[PDB]
Amino acid sequence: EGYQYRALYDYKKEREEDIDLHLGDILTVNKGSLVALGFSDGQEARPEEIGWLNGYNETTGERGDFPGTYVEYIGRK
Numbered sequence: 001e002g003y004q005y006r007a008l009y010d011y012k013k014e015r016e017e018d019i020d021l022h023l024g025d026i027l028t029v030n031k032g033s034l035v036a037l038g039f040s041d042g043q044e045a046r047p048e049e050i051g052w053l054n055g056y057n058e059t060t061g062e063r064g065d066f067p068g069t070y071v072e073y074i075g076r077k
Contacts, residue, residue: 029055
């Protein structure tokens with residue numbers, strides 16, 4: 001069970017490793033990604049506290065990095 005987020009705003013990628021977010025897009029992030037960043041204390045539910053995340057854009061079908069301040073925690077699956 002990875003964590004799911006939803007875009008609040010459009011983000012245009014910068015680095016080669018980023019991805020584009022469009023308003024409404026749904027993304028999943030693997031739990032291991034957050035663990036290996038030292039994120040116990042439940043930051044997963046407050047992504048703006050994380051800075052950058054890495055996951056899969058369920059909507060566009062791409063993978064890469066994206067700002068935590070652009071998304072909204074919607075649960076898990």
